[PDB]
Structures are given as C-alpha cells and as structure tokens.
Amino acid sequence: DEDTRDMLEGVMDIADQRVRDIMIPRSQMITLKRNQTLDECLDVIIESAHSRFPVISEDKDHIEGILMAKDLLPFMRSDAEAFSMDKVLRQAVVVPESKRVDRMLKEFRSQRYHMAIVIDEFGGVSGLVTIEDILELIVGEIEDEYDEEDDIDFRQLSRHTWTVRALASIEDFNEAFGTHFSDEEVDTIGGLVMQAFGHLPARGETIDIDGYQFKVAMADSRRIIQVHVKIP
C-alpha cells in the first residue's frame, strides 16, 4: 500500500535528518517571559493551545526554561496558593542544530520529555524542536480518504502542511493562505499545480511554485484530486 510506503520511507529519513530540518524557527516560536503576569500567560497558552512554552529571560537575553501548561493546574484548587514563575519553571535542554534526528528521538524517549531548544554554533537560539515534529516525519503523508467531496478545501495536517482539495479555486486558496497565485489560464488549485508541472503528475510528485511545496497527495489518470502544500 501507499500510505505504508510513506511511513516506511519516513523512517529512512530519521537517519539522514538533522535537528535543523524539523525545528520551529525562532520567529515561529510561541513563547513567554519570566516577567509576565499569571493572568496574561493564560491568554498566550489558550490562543496557541500548546502544552509547552519556552520562557524568555527578561530582556530577550537568554531563555530560562520551559513551562508546561499542565503545571498550572495545581494553582486552581481551593486551598491553592498564588502562581509564581518558579515552581513550574523546569530548566530546559539545549541541542546543536547539527544533532541527528535519530539521536534526538532516543533521548526524547529515554529521558521522557517532549521539547528541546536548538542553538547554533555561536550560542544563539535557532528555534525549538519536539517529539511530534519527529513522528511527523513518518506519519505526515497520512490522512483519510474523501469521495464526493467536502466543502472543506483546506485542512491543517501538521505544523506547516495543509491538505487541500484540487478543486479548490485559486481564489479561495489565496484568501485562506494569503497567497498571490494567478488565474486566467487556470481556475483551481490542481490546474495551477498541473501547470507548474506541465504534465499530469502522479502521487508523490512535488513542485515548488513560489516557495510553497506542493505534493500530489491523490491523483488518477484524468486529474489531480488532493494536494498537500507546505507553507514556507
């Protein structure tokens, strides 16, 4: 089967891949500062709906440790005290960008924890990395099957990856992802893609349009059906 093949291959990546291949870049990092009121911290956590957040020093200097949202539950009882960024400040692990993904997985599983901090040679933070970013390597081409079709063109699938119906219009796609794609020649996403290709692709084929990775998720002998796109 294909979806097996995908995973199988995804396994082979883990060797070849380094940590600098899966990290959330520092820009994209949703974090906190040791000097933030308990009240406001919850907003960040809620809008983002994560589980672990890096804590910036105070002057964007260093970054102290990591806060797990679940630790905030103690502070919620009756005979419960006031929160303070101290009991729940787990210090945090740092790793080179050069670190091998396989190795990361081992340590992840063995020390039992989910997020680390990636740094460059020069001691700057490049970003962060997590266990799920690893499993996505194997499990990321994996999704359900759709027949008639669903009003939902676009679906988030992993961090940077959406599974979009090919029949979705360039109009509707551009709105959603805020993209600047063009029609006239073609009106739907599958036509855009098929045009970039210049032939009718088969599943797995990939093509770069304007820094966006498009991969033929699903296609027959007449037409592209589903395509995954990776936001840059």
Next chain:
Amino acid sequence: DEDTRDMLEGVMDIADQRVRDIMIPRSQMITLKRNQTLDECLDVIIESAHSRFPVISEDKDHIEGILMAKDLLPFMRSDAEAFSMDKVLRQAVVVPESKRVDRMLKEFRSQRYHMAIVIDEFGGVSGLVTIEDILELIVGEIEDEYDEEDDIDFRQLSRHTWTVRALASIEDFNEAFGTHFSDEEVDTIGGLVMQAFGHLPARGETIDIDGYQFKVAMADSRRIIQVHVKIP
C-alpha cells in the same frame, strides 16, 4: 541499523493490527464522572498527568464525552466564571474493537483529535485508544544507550513497557513491579530471563515468564545487558 529495523517493522504492524490490540482496557482507564466537583477533578488529572479523560455518565451507565485538561484553563482568569461540566464537555467518538489500526490513524490525523472510545459488539465499553498508542507501535523499541550503567534499573518507556537493566536483581525488580520472581539459581534479571530461555538470547528474542513479556533489548556474546518487560 537495528533501531531502524524496529521502526520499519513497527510500520508493518499497523496493517495487521486492530484497535483491540492497543487499547487501554476499561479497568486501566483513568476517568471522571459528570457529577464531580471542579475541585476534585483536578486531583485525578494531576496525579494521572494526562490530557484527555472520559466522563462517566453518573451511574456508570453510559459515558458522556471527553474532557481535555487544557479546556480548564479558561476557568483560571480574573474575569473568569465558575467551571461547569458543559462548555468543556466535548462529545466523544466510539469505534469497534475490530477497527483497523491504519484506519484509526487516518481518522485520528484527518479529524485532528487524539483519543477515542472502543466498544464491543454488545455496546459495552472495552476501553479507550489514542494516537500515541499507535505511534508506539513503530517507535516503542526506541531508547538511548547506556555504558557504565545507571543506578536506574527500571524506566517507563510506554504504557505497559519498562526498560530494565539485566544486572538489576530479582530482589529489586520484584519490589518495584510487585512481582513474585525467584532466586537461588539466579540473582539478576538477565539470569532469570536467560534461564527461562535456556540459552543466551540475541536482541529481539522474547520469552513469557508469568504473563510478563521479556524482550532482549540489548545483549552481546557473553551476556544479556538490557531487557524490556511488558506488564500484563
């Protein structure tokens, strides 16, 4: 490499496996009841340190939905109201035990949610199942490497699986896991195992002692080094 081989094989399972192979049985299920004070619910959640919990009807009858611990964060602000088992009661998905693991993974990933409810033919709950129970199939033989050795004999690795040093004594092992294993002939865990075998096993070999699954995680040409055990 071996740890690749493991994963690769773990992928092959996903086809052959059904949902009734990975579920947490109803006994082992950490849950809640719609009629539990906000205060006490936190205790359950904290001791267990989970993320999603099934809510029992009120008379152990049906089970209503699932509560995600993160939803409890809204109720923690200043201008925040009183919690009520209603806004945070997501209804919950149910599946046959017969369900194919691959299929489950697809739906898991596509609808984006992590836990489901397994039922038998007759409409009884058999247990629950989650996305991580799936990824463990591929990623569960995966751990770090140890040289000298660490005072830590035993380590949790996944739900039912500990990675124990072979040099660990039957004495110390029995205490920990509450087991009734015997010495005289042999004093360490690797000897117990090697004795059950009757030869020096190679990595991957498995042997059932008293309902406990032992698998040679790590062994050379002289001795068993690490072994994983699956609590029944």
